[PDB]
Amino acid sequence: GLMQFTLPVRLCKEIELFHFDIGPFENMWPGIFVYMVHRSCGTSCFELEKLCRFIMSVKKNYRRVPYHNWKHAVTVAHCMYAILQNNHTLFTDLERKGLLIACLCHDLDHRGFSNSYLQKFDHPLAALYSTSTMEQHHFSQTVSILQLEGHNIFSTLSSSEYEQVLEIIRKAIIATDLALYFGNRKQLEEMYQTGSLNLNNQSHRDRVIGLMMTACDLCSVTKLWPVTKLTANDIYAEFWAEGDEMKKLGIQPIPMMDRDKKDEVPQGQLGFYNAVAIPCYTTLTQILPPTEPLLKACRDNLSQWEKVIRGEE
Numbered sequence: 558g559l560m561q562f563t564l565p566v567r568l569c570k571e572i573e574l575f576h577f578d579i580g581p582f583e584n585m586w587p588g589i590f591v592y593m594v595h596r597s598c599g600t601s602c603f604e605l606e607k608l609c610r611f612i613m614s615v616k617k618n619y620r621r622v623p624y625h626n627w628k629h630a631v632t633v634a635h636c637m638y639a640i641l642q643n644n645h646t647l648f649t650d651l652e653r654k655g656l657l658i659a660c661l662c663h664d665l666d667h668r669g670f671s672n673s674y675l676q677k678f679d680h681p682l683a684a685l686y687s688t689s690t691m692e693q694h695h696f697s698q699t700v701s702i703l704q705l706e707g708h709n710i711f712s713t714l715s716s717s718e719y720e721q722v723l724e725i726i727r728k729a730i731i732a733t734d735l736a737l738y739f740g741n742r743k744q745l746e747e748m749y750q751t752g753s754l755n756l757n758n759q760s761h762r763d764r765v766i767g768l769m770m771t772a773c774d775l776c777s778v779t780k781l782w783p784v785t786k787l788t789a790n791d792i793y794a795e796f797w798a799e800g801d802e803m804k805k806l807g808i809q810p811i812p813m814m815d816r817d818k819k820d821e822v823p824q825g826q827l828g829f830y831n832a833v834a835i836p837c838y839t840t841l842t843q844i845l846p847p848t849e850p851l852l853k854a855c856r857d858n859l860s861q862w863e864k865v866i867r868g869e870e
């Protein structure tokens with residue numbers, strides 16, 4: 558109980574900021590996550606011995622892919638930590654417990670391929686889960702790891718609290734399916750504007766938690782330019798591999814995923830910032846005012862991408 562994790566001074570200060578980069582030392586990421594849980598939740602939330610065992614199984618079930626990896630898991634959980642810390646009073650005890658675990662687990666056992674490629678490949682997972690294929694797999698993997706012996710970090714919860722937290726986790730992981738984001742943002746938009754957005758309505762909470770999950774999942778677009786730019790390379794290394802695999806099934810891939818069309822990537826980033834990122838953080842800022850720094854950082858990176866096209870870098 559009296560065993561606080563502390564970070565070196567630069568990390569202690571910068572981890573509070575939305576734009577924090579968890580760094581290149583993998584050995585520090587578990588401790589960074591524990592520190593975030595202890596400050597976001599309490600030193601009481603989780604029995605440390607169980608949490609540390611949970612974290613190491615979770616790490617072991619992420620794959621060595623360019624982007625959808627362990628570092629992404631912890632980066633997404635750090636964004637959730639920043640939102641939750643800048644919106645202290647708005648979230649329940651159980652939500653704070655659940656959402657950092659959801660974010661750490663949201664891409665469990667990802668192979669670096671989209672739901673579309675599983676469907677065209679005819680992967681067993683596409684037969685088992687017709688929509689949000691990889692996301693239902695991520696939640697399935699989460700439940701499996703929680704049910705390993707010595708891994709149930711939720712044991713001190715009641716039967717009802719247990720079901721509520723796993724329901725929070727399930728909706729949260731499903732919501733990272735970007736196919737679901739568009740409808741979810743549109744409905745949050747209409748609720749906020751007409752003024753009917755009511756945070757005591759559990760269905761309205763679900764929607765808001767989903768937008769947060771999208772915001773955290775995309776947060777590589779909200780980092781300082783050199784981080785955002787270098788993460789773009791890992792992101793497109795998975796897209797191009799998926800494009801290669803599409804051509805192998807005799808399907809010309811969308812240009813995004815075609816490694817012959819690398820010249821079209823900067824224009825593709827504009828589309829993505831304009832169509833997905835800018836609206837995502839706009840709507841989130843309107844619902845949760847203290848997350849504005851995500852919108853600001855997102856807008857700055859859009860400006861950096863327009864500069865790449867103009868030729869000035």
Ligand SMILES: Cn1c(N)nc2c3cccnc3ccc21
Nearest residue numbers: 735774775776777778792813829
């Ligand atoms: C097509 N596309 C999808 N599905 N996710 C992303 C993305 C996610 C984080 C950062 N940059 C990104 C650029 C393009 C993306």
Ligand SMILES: [Mg+2]
Nearest residue numbers: 663664691733
């Ligand atoms: Mg995912």
Ligand SMILES: [Zn+2]
Nearest residue numbers: 663664733774
């Ligand atoms: Zn993700």
